[PDB]
RNA sequence: GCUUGAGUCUCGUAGAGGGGGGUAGAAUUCCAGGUGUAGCGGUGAAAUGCGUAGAGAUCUGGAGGAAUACCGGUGGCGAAGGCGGCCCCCUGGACGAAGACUGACGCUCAGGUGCGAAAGCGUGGGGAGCAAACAGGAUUAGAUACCCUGGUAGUCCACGCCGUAAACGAUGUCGACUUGGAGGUUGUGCCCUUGAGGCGUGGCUUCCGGAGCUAACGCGUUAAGUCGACCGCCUGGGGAGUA
C-alpha cells in the first residue's frame, strides 16, 4: 500500500515513556508504537527493554509500505532512545541519519517548581 | 554628523529594483550633505536559516556618514518598504573603507 | 573578532550546532571573546550564521 | 544532530548527542526558576574547582 | 557629558583666557550648562534615577563652589550669578 | 600665599550602569488543517486528568505573551536595591596617558531629602508559561502538608503607593602607615618582537598566608593590624520590638 520506501523514525523518549512514530519524509505518520502499549505498564515502561520492544513493534505494522531507508529523529532524554535505534537496525532498516531534535529553549518559558521529595 | 553601517536584505524577486533603490538611498544621504564611504552589493547570497521561508536573498552594505535624522527616515523607509527584509544600522566606529 | 562580516573567522569560533565556543577551549583573551560573541550574534541576526542546526 | 549514512557501515555510533544537549541541558530546564540556588550552586562549583 | 566645542566656548567666555579651565567661575559655568541641558533630558524619562544621581552631584558641586567663591570674593560672586541667571 | 588634599580641561579605554523605542531566534500554550491509531500523562506505586466525539506522536499555517540558551567566567558595571539576545536614540559614572588651570574649594553628618529586591495596594491594560488561594487524586492513624492532576490573584506593561529583607563582606564613611605569594579583569610606557617576548607602572577584584590582633573561630596592605576625624548603635534572658 502506497509504497513509500523511505521514512523517518521519530522516537520520543521521555522519562516515563518512549513513543516511536515511523513516518515518511513529508511528515505523515505511517504507524506508531509506545512502550506503554506493549505490556509492562508502570515502572517498567521506562526502560531500554521496553523501548526496544516498542521499536520492534513499530517496525512491524509498517510492513505495508516497504520502508528500507529511514532517518532517526530523537527527542527528549530517557532510558530509551539508544536501545531504540538499535532495535531499528535489528529490523532490517538501513539507518541513514541519526539527529537529536530535543527542544531547547533560548531561555523561554518558566519551568515548573517541583519535587521536594 | 556621525558614522553608520547599514546592511539590508532585499526580497530576491525584487533584485532588479536593487540598484535603483541604492541610488535613491544614496541620494537621500546627499540631501543632508552627508557622504557615503563604501557601498557593496553582495549578490544573492544563501541564507543560513529561512525567513518567510524565502532562502537566498540580496544583501547591500552601505557605511554612510550622515546626521542622524536622515538615518532615522532611512530606517522608516526600511520599515514600510515591503521589498527590504532585515535592515541593520550600526555604530560610528569611525569611517571604514575596505572589503570583507 | 572585531568584525562580524568575516564569517570564516566567526565560523571557526562556533560549534557544529551554532553555539559559541567558550574561551576555556579556544584561548581568546576575554576582551576578544566578548567582541567575538557580540559579532556572532550580529551575524546570526543577518542570517550569515545560523542560530542552530535545526531551522 | 545529523549524521549521514556511510557507504560501508553497520553502526553510525554518532557522538553528536553527547557533546552538548542530553546530559545537562535538558535535565537543567526541568525545574524551577530561582536566581538564588544557581548563584550558590555556581559559587560552590567554582569554589570546589580548586587544588 | 557636554560637547567639546561647548566646553571650549564656556572656557573662552568665563576664563581669564583659554587654558584657564579650572577657575571657579569656569567650573560653575560648565556645571550650569550641563544642569540646564539635562533639565531637557529629565523633563522626559523621569525615571532615570541613575542619571539623576549624576545630576544631583552636579548641583551639589556647583553649590560648594558658589559657597567658596562667595566667601572669597563677593564681587566675582555677584557678577557670576548675575551672568548665569541662577539664584532665582 | 603655596601645592603634595579636592576639583576643571584635553585624548582614549572597558563595561548586563540608567531611561525610551524597535527587532530577532529557539521553546511552551492555544487555534485551524493533513497523516495516523490505541492509548497518553503521571508516580515509589497509583489514581484524579486527557483520549476512538480520534488523544498522545507527527507535519503545515497562524496568534499571543513572557524570558532572553551557547558566550558566561570566586567575569563586569552600579552608592545600595540591582543590571544578561541584537540594534538605535537620550544619559550617569569610573579608569588610564601626558600637559595645563583653580588654589584647601576638604572629611563626616543629627534633623531633612532622595533612591530602595520580593510580596502587597490603587487605577487602566495584558495574560503564553509558572503558580499562593482553591478543587480533585493519593499518602497517612490523621494529612487543612510534602507527591500527582487542574488552577484564580499574582508574576508582565503604564502611572501612583508601600518601605521592608539573612536589604549580609551579619564588617558605617573618609584618610594615613605596616612583610609576602598565586591568579582574574581593564588601562599604559619602555626595551632585537627577533616565542607561547621581556621589564615596569596604575584602577578594580579572588584565593592563601606573615607580624599583629582576636574569647576562639578567624581577619590578614580590600584588616577584624597600627592611628586620626565624624556619625550610627549596645548595656542580662523573657515580656517585646509588643502595648
Amino acid at each position: 500500500r502506497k509504497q513509500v520506501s523511505d521514512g523517518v523514525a521519530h522516537i520520543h523518549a521521555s522519562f516515563n515513556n518512549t513513543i516511536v512514530t515511523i513516518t515518511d519524509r513529508q511528515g505523515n505518520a505511517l504507524g506508531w508504537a509506545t512502550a506503554g502499549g506493549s505490556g509492562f505498564r508502570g515502572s517498567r515502561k521506562s526502560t531500554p527493554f521496553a523501548a526496544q520492544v516498542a521499536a520492534e513493534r513499530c517496525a512491524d505494522a509498517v510492513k505495508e509500505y516497504g520502508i528500507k531507508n529511514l532517518e532517526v529523529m530523537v527527542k527528549g532524554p530517557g532510558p530509551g532512545r539508544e536501545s531504540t535505534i538499535r532495535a531499528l537496525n535489528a529490523a532490517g532498516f538501513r539507518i541513514t541519519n541519526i539527529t537529536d531534535v530535543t527542544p531547547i529553549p533560548h531561555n523561554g518559558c518558566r519551568p515548573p517548581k517541583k519535587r521536594r521529595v | 554628523m556621525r558614522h553608520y553601517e547599514i546592511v539590508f536584505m532585499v526580497h530576491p524577486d525584487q533584485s532588479e529594483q536593487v540598484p535603483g533603490m541604492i541610488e535613491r538611498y544614496t541620494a537621500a544621504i546627499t540631501g543632508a550633505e552627508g557622504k557615503i564611504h563604501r557601498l557593496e552589493d553582495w549578490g544573492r547570497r544563501q541564507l543560513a536559516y529561512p525567513i518567510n521561508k524565502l532562502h537566498k536573498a540580496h544583501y547591500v552594505l552601505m557605511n554612510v556618514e550622515a546626521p542622524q535624522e536622515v538615518i532615522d527616515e532611512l530606517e522608516t523607509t526600511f520599515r514600510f518598504n515591503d521589498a527590504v527584509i532585515r535592515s541593520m544600522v550600526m555604530r560610528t566606529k569611525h569611517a571604514v573603507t575596505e572589503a570583507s | 573578532e572585531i568584525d562580524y562580516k568575516d564569517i570564516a573567522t566567526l565560523k571557526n569560533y562556533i560549534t557544529e550546532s551554532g553555539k559559541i565556543v567558550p574561551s576555556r577551549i579556544t584561548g581568546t583573551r576575554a576582551k576578544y571573546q566578548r567582541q567575538l560573541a557580540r559579532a556572532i550574534k550580529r551575524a546570526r541576526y543577518l542570517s550569515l550564521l545560523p542560530y542552530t542546526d535545526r531551522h | 544532530i545529523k549524521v549521514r549514512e556511510n557507504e560501508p557501515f553497520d553502526v553510525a555510533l554518532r557522538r553528536f548527542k553527547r557533546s552538548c544537549e542530553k546530559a545537562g541541558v535538558l535535565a537543567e530546564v526541568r525545574r524551577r526558576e530561582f536566581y538564588e540556588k544557581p548563584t550558590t550552586e555556581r559559587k560552590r562549583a567554582k569554589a570546589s574547582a580548586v587544588k | 557629558s557636554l560637547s567639546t566645542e561647548a566646553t571650549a566656548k564656556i572656557v573662552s567666555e568665563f576664563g581669564r583666557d583659554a587654558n584657564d579651565t579650572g577657575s571657579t567661575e569656569v567650573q560653575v559655568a560648565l556645571l550650569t550648562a550641563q544642569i540646564n541641558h539635562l533639565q531637557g533630558h529629565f523633563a522626559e524619562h523621569k525615571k532615570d534615577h541613575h542619571s539623576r544621581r549624576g545630576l544631583l552631584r552636579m548641583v551639589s558641586q556647583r553649590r560648594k563652589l558658589l559657597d567658596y567663591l562667595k566667601r572669597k570674593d563677593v564681587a566675582r560672586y555677584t557678577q557670576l550669578i548675575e551672568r548665569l541667571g541662577l539664584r532665582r
Side-chain angles (χ1 to χ4, degrees), chain A, chain B, chain C, chain D residues 1-4 6-51, chain E residues 1-78 80-88:
Chain A
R1 178 182 65 205
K2 196 59 146 75
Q3 195 55 251
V4 64
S5 76
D6 53 351
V8 182
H10 292 96
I11 68 179
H12 180 81
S14 66
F15 278 113
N16 292 322
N17 191 7
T18 65
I19 158 173
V20 181
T21 292
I22 287 173
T23 172
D24 54 356
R25 286 183 54 181
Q26 301 298 322
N28 304 322
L30 308 170
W32 55 267
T34 68
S38 300
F40 41 71
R41 178 59 58 187
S43 62
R44 297 168 65 238
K45 76 181 173 75
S46 67
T47 48
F49 182 72
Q52 76 158 326
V53 74
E56 288 171 3
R57 186 171 178 182
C58 191
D60 182 79
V62 292
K63 288 177 189 294
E64 294 284 329
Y65 295 95
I67 297 171
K68 297 294 168 63
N69 292 323
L70 46 71
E71 291 85 7
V72 176
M73 292 179 69
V74 186
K75 276 199 183 159
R81 66 92 72 80
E82 181 163 36
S83 65
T84 302
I85 70 179
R86 292 185 189 287
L88 267 64
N89 65 10
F93 289 147
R94 183 177 173 83
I95 174 173
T96 298
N97 295 327
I98 316 175
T99 67
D100 179 73
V101 289
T102 64
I104 299 299
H106 289 356
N107 267 348
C109 285
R110 175 195 267 244
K113 180 147 215 304
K114 61 213 180 86
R115 306 304 287 168
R116 279 163 282 149
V117 281
Chain B
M1 183 180 291
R2 74 175 78 197
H3 305 278
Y4 291 100
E5 181 175 356
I6 294 101
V7 299
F8 59 96
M9 292 65 259
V10 182
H11 189 194
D13 297 331
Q14 314 207 326
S15 299
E16 291 81 9
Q17 300 163 20
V18 164
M21 289 196 282
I22 291 172
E23 189 67 30
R24 293 190 288 109
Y25 294 157
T26 302
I29 305 305
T30 62
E33 292 187 317
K35 59 187 178 293
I36 173 169
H37 287 91
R38 76 209 272 186
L39 173 66
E40 286 184 356
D41 191 4
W42 288 355
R44 287 203 293 278
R45 185 184 176 84
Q46 178 74 258
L47 293 186
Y49 55 84
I51 49 180
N52 295 319
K53 297 293 201 185
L54 202 57
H55 303 275
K56 317 173 163 202
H58 198 180
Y59 291 20
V60 173
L61 165 69
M62 206 169 288
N63 286 102
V64 160
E65 182 183 0
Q68 76 176 30
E69 192 268 332
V70 293
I71 303 297
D72 188 77
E73 74 183 7
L74 182 61
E75 289 178 355
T76 63
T77 303
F78 291 156
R79 289 282 200 289
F80 163 69
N81 190 5
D82 190 73
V84 49
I85 54 168
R86 265 179 192 72
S87 301
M88 170 187 267
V89 46
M90 290 178 292
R91 315 274 297 207
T92 303
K93 55 170 162 194
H94 293 83
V96 299
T97 307
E98 58 202 333
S100 189
Chain C
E1 314 198 314
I2 42 91
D3 196 1
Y4 72 94
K5 295 175 285 297
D6 286 336
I7 74 160
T9 304
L10 271 67
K11 204 135 64 55
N12 292 318
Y13 290 150
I14 195 181
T15 193
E16 298 155 16
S17 69
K19 289 169 45 187
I20 294 172
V21 186
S23 63
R24 157 201 204 117
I25 297 300
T26 63
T28 68
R29 294 308 170 273
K31 184 181 167 201
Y32 298 101
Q33 176 60 251
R34 293 192 290 280
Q35 286 169 10
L36 175 60
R38 174 195 191 84
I40 296 291
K41 298 165 183 181
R42 293 164 199 265
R44 287 169 169 169
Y45 173 74
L46 292 172
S47 194
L48 291 167
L49 293 176
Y51 284 100
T52 182
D53 53 351
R54 281 160 57 211
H55 283 284
Chain D
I1 333 276
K2 56 150 268 68
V3 264
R4 282 156 297 180
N6 296 350
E7 282 75 26
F9 84 116
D10 298 347
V11 189
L13 45 100
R14 81 292 161 258
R15 298 174 175 92
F16 221 137
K17 258 109 279 203
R18 294 300 168 265
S19 184
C20 300
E21 287 89 5
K22 169 60 168 84
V25 179
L26 213 139
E28 177 190 331
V29 197
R30 171 205 211 166
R31 203 178 158 274
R32 184 190 165 189
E33 183 54 39
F34 292 94
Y35 200 72
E36 172 66 36
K37 186 181 81 52
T39 298
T40 64
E41 178 195 334
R42 290 187 174 92
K43 193 164 306 181
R44 305 300 161 215
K46 293 285 290 215
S48 297
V50 78
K51 176 63 219 303
Chain E
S1 300
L2 195 52
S3 300
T4 307
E5 193 173 22
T7 57
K9 184 152 197 180
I10 300 166
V11 174
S12 69
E13 288 186 358
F14 282 92
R16 291 190 299 278
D17 54 352
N19 284 323
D20 181 78
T21 181
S23 185
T24 313
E25 294 95 353
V26 173
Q27 300 181 31
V28 162
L30 266 62
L31 292 172
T32 302
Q34 196 65 38
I35 285 165
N36 294 127
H37 181 74
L38 254 53
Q39 288 291 323
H41 166 76
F42 279 109
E44 190 180 356
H45 300 299
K46 216 186 329 206
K47 288 297 204 188
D48 196 355
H49 296 288
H50 285 75
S51 299
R52 200 186 296 271
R53 165 161 150 116
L55 176 66
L56 294 162
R57 189 172 169 289
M58 293 175 201
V59 169
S60 68
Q61 187 165 322
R62 176 171 85 171
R63 189 55 173 173
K64 285 176 178 173
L65 267 55
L66 263 59
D67 295 331
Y68 174 65
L69 185 125
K70 184 178 189 212
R71 65 175 171 74
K72 293 295 291 206
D73 195 2
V74 198
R76 293 171 70 197
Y77 182 75
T78 308
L80 181 64
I81 73 172
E82 174 191 335
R83 187 173 177 182
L84 268 68
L86 62 87
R87 184 61 54 216
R88 303 169 296 281

